[PDB]
Design a protein around this ligand. Structure first.
Ligand SMILES: CC[C@H](C)[C@H](N)C(=O)O
Ligand SMILES: [Cl-]
Length: 570
């Protein structure tokens, strides 16, 4: 009665603050710990590692430890750093199962000497710390003795004292070995997704309640242009596509809960497996190869057009089904592929809907068209330009800006000088929000319009009152259909937001997969069944053409509001 795995591919997720270590003991003198650890770049990309840690005890562990395994340890860390100094904190909690709390002497002080090389670049750091062995807390300050670190200081986390960890009903085996005096040694091996590796070896001496630790490090095989050797690792920040990933995970989690509550697929439960492509082409190909090697046959997601297209090549070649709830560029479904479907519409249709609204209902005097030079935004800007030229509208200029720009002073001064009364922007909320708040600060009265990628609460968060009165194209308000009220209430009961279109397109993708899995487990048979039939969903009855596109899909025109809400424009 094994679970059916479904991959859900998000983008620039935060993820869990706590990470789980699994502890096992093959004999009385050895404890083995296994760990998955992903780092994040300043760019919002993931850098993936796995670790195996070996603890060697001089005297055998007490029988109670050997009878009670495996154990699970939840840990979280904080780092502030310069290029010469590190300030660190760690929290640790042990359990006999996978369910968190849900929301002579033991040690008091310690010192660390950590040294070695990364790609042959030498380092040496020393410093003092303290902690509480009753609750699993520790803190540490480290200073360089050899000047500036010429690699990311994050590569030395988590390596920078399990003598501070208690177990549920008494001392950990680490604490018992320190109190006895005979102690333990540690060896860790880390493997990275680019083929790099790092080893650490530890030795300790106990002077009463004070621990003296020594750690020797050797790292090799890091790419010269990678984030370790360029100092490009950071703590997680919200990024440009986080809003889109959060909507997809909200809709997938509620749909899988509802399906499983009704008995799953002929009694077998669905299990979500989460991945993250950062809407980046190289990360999308790395994710798709991992999904195939993990044995998964069904994928929901790859959200942006520039990441869904390279991923689709890998899934088609390997015989895997892919359903995107969000990618709208026509080229995805224009190449003869048989295993690719959507639960959203096409930018050829979205751009023509915008051009007809401008010609029929707005009738402006002087138009500018702006885009971000990416597949989605530049495609829409070209579709709108063609529609307006056919209607003989006055387009004064057509121009590109750079994605990630925060200073729009040149564009704002040009709109003021050239007396522009209407702008169409093709692109995402981060750039549109900066353009709106900088335009109103400088006294512009211009009417703005954009596509479904700007119609979200992150646009309102960035622009504030400057967002009021923006025109948008987007899918219908599915959250206002009475038949969908039970889903709206279940999402609001978790303090989550059911208003974004990608909640509904993602829920509908899981309902479409469910209908297929009731007929066959084989991806090619599922794609054939959906292309020949109608499926009832939260979006209404869905049908697909032979290339995997929705038949009769319509984008609406709405007024956007500063409170993150959309109303019918007419
Ligand atoms: C996340 C989807 C975005 C907004 C857009 N529709 C694209 O295809 O890139
Ligand atoms: Cl460990």
């Amino acid at each position: 009665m094994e679970d059916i795995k479904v991959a859900v591919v998000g983008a620039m997720s935060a993820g869990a603050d706590w990470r789980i270590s699994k502890e096992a003991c093959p004999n009385g003198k050895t404890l083995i710990s296994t760990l998955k650890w992903s780092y994040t770049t300043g760019d919002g990309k993931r850098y993936r590692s796995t670790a195996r840690t070996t603890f060697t005890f001089a005297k055998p562990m007490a029988a109670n430890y050997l009878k009670n395994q495996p154990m699970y340890v939840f840990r979280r860390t904080e780092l502030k750093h310069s290029k010469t100094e590190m300030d660190f904190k760690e929290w640790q909690k042990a359990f006999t199962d996978v369910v968190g709390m849900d929301e002579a002497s033991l040690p008091a002080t310690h010192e660390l000497h950590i040294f070695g090389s990364i790609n042959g670049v030498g380092f040496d750091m020393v410093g003092q710390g303290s902690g509480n062995p009753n609750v699993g807390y520790e803190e540490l300050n480290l200073k360089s003795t050899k000047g500036e670190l010429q690699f990311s200081p994050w590569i030395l986390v988590p390596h920078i004292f399990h003598q501070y960890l208690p177990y549920p009903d008494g001392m950990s085996p680490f604490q018992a070995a320190m109190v006895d005096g005979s102690g333990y040694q540690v060896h860790r091996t880390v493997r990275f997704e680019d083929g790099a590796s790092l080893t650490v070896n530890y030795r300790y001496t106990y002077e009463g309640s004070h621990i003296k630790g020594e750690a020797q490090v050797k790292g090799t095989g890091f790419p010269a242009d990678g984030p370790v050797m360029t100092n490009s690792l950071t703590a997680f920040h919200i990024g440009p596509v986080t809003q889109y990933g959060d909507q997809e995970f909200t809709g997938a989690e509620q749909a899988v809960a509802d399906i499983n509550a009704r008995g799953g697929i002929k009694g077998n439960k669905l299990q979500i497996v989460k991945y993250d492509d950062a809407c980046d082409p190289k990360q999308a190909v790395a994710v798709a190869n991992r999904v195939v090697n993990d044995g998964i046959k069904y994928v929901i997601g790859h959200l942006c057009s520039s990441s869904a297209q390279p991923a689709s090549d890998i899934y088609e070649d390997a015989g895997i089904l892919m359903i995107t709830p969000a990618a709208t560029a026509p080229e995805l479904t224009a190449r003869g592929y048989q295993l690719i479907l959507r639960t959203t519409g096409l930018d050829s249709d979205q751009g023509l809907t915008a051009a007809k609204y401008i010609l029929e209902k707005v009738k402006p005097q002087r138009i500018a068209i702006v885009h971000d030079k990416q597949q989605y935004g530049e495609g829409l800007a070209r579709a709108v330009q063609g529609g307006l030229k056919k209607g003989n509208a006055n387009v004064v200029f057509f121009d590109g800006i750079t994605a990630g720009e925060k200073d729009f002073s040149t564009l704002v001064a040009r709109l003021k000088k050239e007396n522009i009364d209407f702008v169409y922007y093709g692109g995402y909320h981060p750039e549109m929000g900066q353009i709106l708040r900088q335009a109103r600060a400088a006294g512009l009265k211009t009417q703005f319009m954009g596509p479904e990628g700007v119609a979200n609460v992150s646009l309102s968060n960035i622009a504030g009152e400057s967002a009021e009165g923006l025109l948008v194209t987007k899918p219908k308000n599915y959250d206002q259909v009475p038949a969908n009220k039970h889903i709206v209430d279940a999402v609001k009961a978790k303090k989550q937001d059911p208003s974004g279109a990608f909640v509904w397109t993602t829920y509908a993708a899981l309902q479409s997969l469910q209908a297929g899995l009731n007929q066959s487990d084989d991806p090619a048979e599922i794609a054939k069944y959906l292309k020949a039939n109608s499926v009832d969903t939260v979006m209404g009855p869905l049908t697909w053409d032979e290339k995997g596109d929705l038949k009769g899909f319509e984008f609406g025109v709405f007024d956007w509001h500063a409170n993150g809400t959309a109303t019918d424009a007419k």
